[PDB]
Amino acid sequence: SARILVVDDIEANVRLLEAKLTAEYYEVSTAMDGPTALAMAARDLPDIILLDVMMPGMDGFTVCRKLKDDPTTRHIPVVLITALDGRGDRIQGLESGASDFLTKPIDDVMLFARVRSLTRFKLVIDELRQREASGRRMGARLDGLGGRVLIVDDNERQAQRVAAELGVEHRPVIESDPEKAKISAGGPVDLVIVNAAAKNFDGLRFTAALRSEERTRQLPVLAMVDPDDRGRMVKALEIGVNDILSRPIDPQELSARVKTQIQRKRYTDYLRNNLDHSLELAVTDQLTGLHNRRYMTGQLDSLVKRATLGGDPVSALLIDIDFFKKINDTFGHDIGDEVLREFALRLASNVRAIDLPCRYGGEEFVVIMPDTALADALRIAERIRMHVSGSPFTVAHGREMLNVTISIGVSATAGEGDTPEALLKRADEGVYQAKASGRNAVVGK
């Protein structure tokens, strides 16, 4: 379901690429003019753009520059399709802002490698864009330069050339011993460049070893492959390399691929080791151990949409403990936390694991029950009520025992067009009414 925009003047080329890409389960849009491409790019906001440099009127380089000037299309990765000995073409493309390059005649292996790699990058890009938008409301090197690149190659000449090409923009280190390289790769390395055609070690075995250990399982790896051996090239892509580099190594291709991998790694690490560990983006309540409102919100959105399309409904239970303030006033805040934890355990144990028992508020809990009807939901609520009210809660490490009552509000996504908010709203009305009409009760709306 990745959307790719193919841009070329010759109809046959565009259609051929479209056929190949759609056969690989890609949604393909086509443009036959530079201006048309730019308009379509701003309209459809694609995920990847494949653009040919050889275009009468507006050359591909100009289109790329315009794409990189529009702030609405700047994020979209652009691959420039060049011809043989297109070193000048590649230099101008890098100056134009192309993310990577493809050489003509198009190799299906290289084509799909680039598309796969850059679609993954686009995933991370889109996620960061979303999170930045959220974080602006209040609820860090992200370039592709200055990275530690480990070159695992026995060819001293090739290694030196690669290090030199990467020596102005990145920080290269060369290793010839596979074991020493394994030790180093477990450290502060941003990208590993391995020679698949090494003669003193099996680079593919080394790469598989990296992917086998969790420490290095997601370390970005690029493999220098000989264009003759299609088999090893495919195998390298299978053992888990992120992209491939043809031998002899073109400096501009190297620069593009290295920058792509480093930027992807940095984005991903920022999103998962910094942002995801923030207190606002959490999905699990640390006290109870249950999920929070965020998790239920997303899941309930999908559930409710499915229900609108027709089928079995999604039910919701809102449970509010009764007189919790008194628990805290008499036994202290810590005992109240104990009560909350135990309540969470009892609740989760008496509802299905396919259900979503989450902590809606401080003393309020929600149980989203997929494929459940209002009548059955009311009966489940009565079950929960009996289990919580019946058995006492033992606290103070056995020193004291307390009895808890709960008021429950039941709701169901019955009929079409219902929304998560309406379902929760009806459940809240149920809770209010149950609290007014005495306590220890279940009310359905």
Ligand X SMILES: Nc1nc2c(ncn2[C@@H]2O[C@H](COP(=O)(O)OP(=O)(O)OP(=O)(O)O)[C@@H](OP(=O)(O)OP(=O)(O)O)[C@H]2O)c(=O)[nH]1
Ligand Y SMILES: Nc1nc2c(ncn2[C@@H]2O[C@@H]3COP(=O)(O)O[C@H]4[C@@H](O)[C@H](n5cnc6c(=O)[nH]c(N)nc65)O[C@@H]4COP(=O)(O)O[C@H]3[C@H]2O)c(=O)[nH]1
For position 324 contacting ligand X by CB under 6 A, the verdict is yes
Nearer to Mg ion, 221 or 404 (CB): 404
Smallest gap from residue 341 Cβ to ligand X (A)? 9
Query: CB of 272: closest distance to ligand X in angstroms?
Result: 24
> Is residue 302 at the binding interface for its own copies, with CB under 8 A as the rule?
yes
Stretch that binds its own copies, among 63-71, 186-194, 389-397, 428-436 (CB under 8 A): 186-194
Task: Give kind and range of the element (H or E) at residue 369.
Answer: strand 364-369
Q: Which uninterrupted H or E stretch holds 316?
A: strand 315-321
Tokens 């942002």 locate to 275
CB of 335 to Mg ion, least distance (A): 16
Does 167 participate in binding its own copies (rule CB under 8 A)? no
DSSP 242: S
**Residue 228 in marked binding region:** no
Q: Is 320 in the site for Mg ion (CB under 5 A)?
A: yes
Each residue 246-285 as x (binds its own copies by CB under 8 A) or -, in order, gives ---------------------------xx-xxxx--xxx-
Does the footprint of its own copies cover residue 1 (CB under 8 A)?
A: yes
Flag whether 334 is marked binding.
no
Is 289 a binding residue for ligand X by CB under 6 A? The answer is no
Q: Does the annotation list 312 as a binding residue?
A: no
E strands, 160-296, are 171-175, 191-195, 221-225, 243-246
Q: Which residues contact 340 (CB under 8 A, 6 or more apart)?
A: 287, 288, 363
* Alpha carbon distance 41, 11 (integer Å): 19
Helix (H, G, I), strand (E, B), or coil: what is residue 230? helix
Residue 318: which of 373, 380, 404 has the closest Cα? Answer: 380
Q: Does 188 bind its own copies (CB under 8 A)?
A: yes
The response to whether 418 counts as a known ligand-binding position is no
Binding site partner of 140, from ligand Y, its own copies, ligand X, none, Cβ cut-off 5-8 A by kind: its own copies
Which residues on neighbouring strands pair with residue 354, listed in sequence order? none
Q: What is the DSSP string of 41-86?
A: HHHH--SEEEEES--SSS-HHHHHHHHHHSTTTSSS-EEEEE-SS-
For its own copies, which residue of 199, 214, 398, 399 counts as binding (CB under 8 A)?
214
Please report how close the Cβ of residue 431 comes to Mg ion at its closest, in angstroms. Answer: 9
Name the DSSP letter for residue 363: S
Is residue 343 involved in binding ligand X (CB under 6 A)?
A: no
- HSE-CB at 130 with a 13 A cutoff on CA atoms is 9
Q: Does 208 bind its own copies (CB under 8 A)?
A: yes
> Which residue ranges make up the annotated binding site for Mg(2+)?
8-9, 52, 54
Residues found near ligand X in the complex (CB under 6 A): 287, 320-325, 328-329, 333, 336-337, 340, 362-363, 435
